[PDB]
Design a protein around this ligand. Structure first.
Ligand SMILES: CO[C@H]1[C@H](O)[C@@H](O)[C@@H](O[C@H]2[C@H](O)[C@@H](O)[C@@H](O[C@H]3[C@H](O)[C@@H](O)/C(=N/O)N[C@@H]3CO)O[C@@H]2CO)O[C@@H]1CO
Ligand SMILES: *[C@@H]1O[C@H](CO)[C@@H](O)[C@H](O)[C@H]1NC(C)=O
Ligand SMILES: [Ca+2]
Ligand SMILES: [Cl-]
Length: 496
């Protein structure tokens, strides 16, 4: 479960949210491979309901119709082409597996699906799988509505419909088998692992039973006996009976407390300050590092659709976002996932975004290609956070310091902190409303290092800030609170 199966040295995966297969494949070859990214989490590759009201919202992909690899991102041939091209370049693919449910019970019957498959939610008929009434929890769920109504009852959270979504009877070997058939088809294609959507809504034992039916990774790309990477999405902010710890026997779990807390800290809410990050990790009530999948924001909470609150930092908060991501990437806790999104017309009304449903950039419903600008940014409204110099260099920073311990922590008792990773890297943050100018112990060998936040090491020179480490590991750092990026990061590979 617990190993990403990334190519030794690569320590992060990027969520290319709503990206088409052809675009990801190209991205693997032209960027992800050279820039050292470990892998890519793709949007659900299985056929979903085509929702026209509202117009093709991103969430329509979380409403399965069948397991055919046929979506707005592409067909099976295009999917396999992507997985092959990415794998050949040492970049892995992780599937967002929507296996807890099919579509909303209120969806009209017909062929309004991404591959034209017929389906009848009212009669529990999904002939493309095939699933029937006997494959759903309608008779198992004990709530008066048939939907999840109270999260204090761990049973209904698993047996009832999540927001009306037809709940599959995962206890049945047949259902478990159909899911494994889908997942094994993906594995044999070359996928390295999966994001198990809505795992909180599935019994740990049912997930286990499904996992027991999965093959090992494709032996053409991975060593024999490689088990697929499994990260279960379990939204657990505490306060509820269901604990993500119940799922440790299956693989890793998403640690949503990570981004929720990091956001409150960086935004300085409730008296929170960066100096408190000294004991970041399990010390904050987080799951064990080796069982955590961390991220600042995800596809849900970046638009207020999951959990984390208004504290979640997103690309909209570029400056603070870059700092949060940088902290995350520098800190040894958990396996890191970088978000990559698309811009949408956020329109807040009475405290909520009325356009939180808006799907990816499109022309009449057809997702737009990802275009690359000369400055390496993306066009067509794709944000491409993973391409931002500050984020991309921190992804590399993580690879360079991999395995090194958390050391040489410094803090001013307020919001100016710093720490290193063994003798391979050092990072400094200034989130106070005043300047930071001080000599700190870096733990790095003497020399001149390029700050990878403000610049890059190119042709034996630094394009941005330069840091001079003395013979007794010390270096002077100066960061104004008005600096473009109020943080500096240096490592073994940015040394001149
Ligand atoms: C009547 O309820 C409707 C809702 O109003 C409508 O917004 C939508 O619900 C949307 C919901 O708002 C979205 O955040 C998203 O919700 C999914 C999240 O993206 C995903 O990360 C998740 N993790 O547990 N669980 C959800 C199911 O996979 O996908 C569902 C299904 O598309 O479909 C429901 C059923 O038709
Ligand atoms: C670094 O840049 C300077 C000019 O600013 C140049 O003299 C020097 O040769 C460059 N170093 C390398 C290794 O190219
Ligand atoms: Ca369920
Ligand atoms: Cl997630």
């Amino acid at each position: 479960q617990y190993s990403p199966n990334t190519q030794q040295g690569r320590t992060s995966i990027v969520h290319l949210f709503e990206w088409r297969w052809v675009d990801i494949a190209l991205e693997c070859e032209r960027y992800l491979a050279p820039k050292g990214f470990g892998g890519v989490q793709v949007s659900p590759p299985n056929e979903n309901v085509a929702i026209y009201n509202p117009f093709r919202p991103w969430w329509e992909r979380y409403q399965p119709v069948s397991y055919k690899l046929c979506t707005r991102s592409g067909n099976e041939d295009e999917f396999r082409n992507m997985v092959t091209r990415c794998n050949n370049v040492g970049v892995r693919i992780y599937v967002d597996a929507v296996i807890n449910h099919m579509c909303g019970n209120a969806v009209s019957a017909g062929t309004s699906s991404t591959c034209g498959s017929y389906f009848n939610p009212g009669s529990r008929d999904f002939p493309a799988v095939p699933y029937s009434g006997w494959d759903f929890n309608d008779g198992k769920c004990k709530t008066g509505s048939g939907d999840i109504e109270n999260y204090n009852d761990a049973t209904q959270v698993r047996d009832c419909r999540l927001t009306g979504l037809l709940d599959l009877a995962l206890e049945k070997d047949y259902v478990r088998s159909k899911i494994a058939e889908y997942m094994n088809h993906l594995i044999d294609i070359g996928v390295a692992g999966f994001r198990l959507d809505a795992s909180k809504h599935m019994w740990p034992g049912d997930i286990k039973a499904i996992l027991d039916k999965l093959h090992n990774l494709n032996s053409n790309w991975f060593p024999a006996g490689s088990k697929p990477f499994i990260y279960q999405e379990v939204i657990d902010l505490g306060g509820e009976p269901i604990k993500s710890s119940d799922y440790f026997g299956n693989g890793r779990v998403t640690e949503f407390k990570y981004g929720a807390k990091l956001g409150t800290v960086i935004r300085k809410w409730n008296g929170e300050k960066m100096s408190y990050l000294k004991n970041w990790g399990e010390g904050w009530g987080f799951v064990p590092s080796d069982r955590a999948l961390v991220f600042v924001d995800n596809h849900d909470n970046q638009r207020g659709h999951g959990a984390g609150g208004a504290s979640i930092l997103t690309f909209w908060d570029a400056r603070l976002y870059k700092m949060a991501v940088g902290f995350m990437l520098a800190h040894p806790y958990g396996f890191t996932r970088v978000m990559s999104s698309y811009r949408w017309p956020r329109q807040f009304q009475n405290g909520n975004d009325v356009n939180d449903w808006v799907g990816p950039p499109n022309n009449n419903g057809v997702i737009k290609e990802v275009t690359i600008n000369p400055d390496t940014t993306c066009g067509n409204d794709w944000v491409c956070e993973h391409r931002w110099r500050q984020i991309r260099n921190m992804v590399i920073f993580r690879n360079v310091v991999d395995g090194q311990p958390f050391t040489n922590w410094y803090d001013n008792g307020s919001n100016q902190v710093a720490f290193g990773r063994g003798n391979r890297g050092f990072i400094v943050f200034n989130n106070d409303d005043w300047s930071f100018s001080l000599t700190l112990q870096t733990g790095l060998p003497a020399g001149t290092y390029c700050d990878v936040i403000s610049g890059d090491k190119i042709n034996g020179n630094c394009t941005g800030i330069k840091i001079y480490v003395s013979d007794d590991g010390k270096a002077h750092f100066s960061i104004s609170n008005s600096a473009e990026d109020p943080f500096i990061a240096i490592h073994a590979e940015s040394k001149l």
